[PDB]
Amino acid sequence: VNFNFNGLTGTGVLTESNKKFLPFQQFGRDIADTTDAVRDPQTLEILDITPCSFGGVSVITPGTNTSNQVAVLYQDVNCTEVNVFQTRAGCLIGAEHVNNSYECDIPIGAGICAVASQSIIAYTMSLGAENSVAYSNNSIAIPTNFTISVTTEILPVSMTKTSVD
Amino acid sequence: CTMYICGDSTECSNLLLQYGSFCTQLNRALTGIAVEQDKNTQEVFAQVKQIYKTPPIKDFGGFNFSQILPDPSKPSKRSPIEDLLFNKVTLQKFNGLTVLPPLLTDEMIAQYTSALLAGTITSGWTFGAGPALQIPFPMQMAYRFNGIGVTQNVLYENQKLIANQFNSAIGKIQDSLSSTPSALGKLQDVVNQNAQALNTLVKQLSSNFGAISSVLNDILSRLDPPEAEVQIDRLITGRLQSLQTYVTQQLIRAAEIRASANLAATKMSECVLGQSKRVDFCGKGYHLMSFPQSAPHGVVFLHVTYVPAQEKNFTTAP
Amino acid sequence: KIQDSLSSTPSALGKLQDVVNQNAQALNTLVKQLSSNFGAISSVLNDILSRLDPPEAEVQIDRLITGRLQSLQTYVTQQLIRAAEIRASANLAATKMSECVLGQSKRVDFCGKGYHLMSFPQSAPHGVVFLHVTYVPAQEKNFTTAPAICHDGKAHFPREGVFVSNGTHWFVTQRNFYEPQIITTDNTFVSGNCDVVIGIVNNTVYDPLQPELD
Amino acid sequence: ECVLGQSKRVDFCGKGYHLMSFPQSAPHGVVFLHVTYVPAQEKNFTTAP
Amino acid sequence: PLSETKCTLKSFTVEKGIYQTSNFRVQPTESIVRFPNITNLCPFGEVFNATRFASVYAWNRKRISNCVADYSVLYNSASFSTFKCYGVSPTKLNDLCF
């Protein structure tokens, strides 16, 4: 609601609070001088003002060059405030959570990554192909053949020599 | 911007639009350092693609590794030393100034650490080069002596003593960490200064910057626009200047963190994935090998260094 | 395969395209700031000079000058931070050149994954591309091993390499390429007796002098 | 890597093969003297694998 | 959301990835104002229409508290030739509480 408490305008939600005001003070303040609790006229009850539950909105998109399917992530918000998958970062809608694990394609948050098979999937990252090693106290592994690989390592050295007057 | 400078108000949001691409610029810089954090973590930990697993039996010729391998009885699958580190470091969120969670959760970060420990223990250094090649630990450590000009026979004829000394030193690591405050001083300093910068940024809203009130709500409620413009413009100018200062200092601090993370990755690559010859880079004294250990927003190494003891004089000739 | 991957795979030169795009986009934003009026009646100086006499055009041109000056300050600061990052990257590139191209570096995975053999530089637009010719084992075989060989009480350790067996006979071989050799006194050295070292095997170690002796 | 010990990473402790180094205090700085081994007076030879 | 991403990135081709766009803030559904039970009218008539005005040497000061005040009548009344307000806008001066 958009409330006006004796000229103390604001917007948010009024809840019950265990903040036991002493009988003299009217309204409490958080850091940066914002109104957080108030006692209203005609009832004197200690209402707690909290701004309406905010949350950033992010978009997983595989690229308009490939598809128009869009996945929407409402971070740090439980799925009770409007498939739909809950994450440690927030609830991501528009993707189907799966059980198999693949390498990360689009980062999502807290070990979760996202088009595949005509749909958007959201899954726990595959940390890599698990591979135990047959250790013992007397076993040795020695290669019999090798291979020579060439890897391209790319490093910037300079930028455009800009200048502004 | 909208939440920070203005919060729920189109009146100053319109005026903020007059300042051009400042907002997309700041948000882009913050997103860049944010993704750079995940880049740092992945580049410093995910040095091996395949997750290794320690053997079910800990028959390592006498080296009691139970202090650094993850403990199944622990609910979070963390070794005692990493648990102590997490318990040793102690860790703004209301005005649009939010915190995104790290990509690599602590569980999977610990999984990389356990994989690296298992790889080092089981295959020495070859798992960082190519395929993992299992090596019994007495021979692997005999080679690591052989890499600092100490022949194998020293190890083999002193195996029990070297194992006991290594176990005792690992235990003393726990004792030192637990009894010594600020053993995690670097991580505590970085976390504390980041949180303090955030607190100062929040506190800046308690400043008038020349306006007649530090909260734009009441000046909006009590000022006619065609003169409230100058007040709200002063307030926006000051608040945006504060945001620029915060973002710039964050950029510099993130550059320092990037340098430290690159150094950490190089150290893990050269001391963990292999034996490093460059002296005083993998711990004081001659170096053998090291163990990574996950720490909150950081990494902790255990440089296993060989150091000569009581020495005898001799009359010599070249 | 290098040329095939470079030609086929897009964003292979992403490490350079990103810095080029960042510089160009920062410049574009810097230009676009001119379009914003920073709170004054116009974002073009010629209009305010044209339709406002100086005594009250001072305030408008002052708003423009201060806002645009702050924008230029921000741009220069961003460029300075990015130049510091590029400076660090360039020092890393120079170190990599001097340690991988000009010579062979034993620093693991500093000149490409695996054991490093040599490197080839290649000029790139505002960058350098390294070709790290590295050596990587492929196929490995298990063997039964032993940290020592006990012969007539004396211990014997490998002078260089390890002891391995295929299950029936022992051999000395180097530690990165299976190349078994019969155990002789030339590639092994003696140290003490064989009752202090654990987990060792009784065996014979050949003496090259004896076959010519007899 | 140069004073407290001998390095092998080329062109990190001065031009040429590195022998050792000496630090020297300087106003708001340091000056190393990298003493390095540089060959010369080469001769051509016929060589075989 | 796809169009919003296109809008923010100021382009059509969006690269494959995650992009932060805005903040989800459910708008208020209705507006409420809470004011006390006070009903008395402070003697603004007796101040703006005082029998005798004190000189500046002994300017008369009258406390006003614990009532509801109608600045609307005095503002609309053009009897006041000059009505200059600093720090508060005279139009919504009736809105606030003091």
- Chain E interface residues facing chain A, Cβ-Cβ under 8 Å? 1-2, 4-6, 12-26, 28-37, 95-98
CB contact B50 to E (< 8 Å): no
Residue C39's CB is within 10 A of a number of other CB atoms, namely 18
CB contact C135 to A (< 8 Å): yes
* Angle (CA) B19 B253 B185, round 5°: 145
Quote the CA–CA distance of B276 and B90 in Å, as a whole number: 33
Q: Look at the alpha carbons of C52, C57, C60, C62 in this order and tell me if their dihedral is positive or negative.
A: positive
Chains with ≥3 CB–CB distances under 8 Å to C: A, B, D
* Angle (CA) B292 B293 B294, round 5°: 125
Quote the CA–CA distance of A71 and A63 in Å, as a whole number: 11
Kindly list the distances between the CA atom of residue B313 and the CA atoms of B280, B310, D41, in Å, as whole numbers in the listed order.
Answer: 26, 10, 41
Burial of B36 (0-12, 13-18, 19+ CB in 10 A): middle
Method by which this entry was solved: cryo-EM
Which one, of C84, C93, C103, C91, lies nearest residue C128 by Cα?
C93
Paired tokens of A142: 């020695």
Residue type, C102: L
DSSP result, A8-20: EEEESEEEE----
Instruction: Give the H/E segment covering residue B254.
Output: helix B225-267
Cβ–Cβ under 8 Å, residues B50 and A128: yes
Bridge partners (DSSP) of residue B286 are B306
Backbone φ, ψ for residue C120 (5° rounding): -125, 120
Cβ–Cβ under 8 Å, residues A65 and A34: no
Choose among A142, A144, A157: nearest Cβ to C93: A157
Kindly list the distances between the CA atom of residue E63 and the CA atoms of A28, B136, E37, E41, E85, in Å, as whole numbers in the listed order.
Answer: 28, 93, 20, 13, 19
Give E95→chain B minimum CA distance, Å: 8
Place of tokens 């395929």: B131
- With CA atoms as reference, the chain A residue closest to B137 would be A137
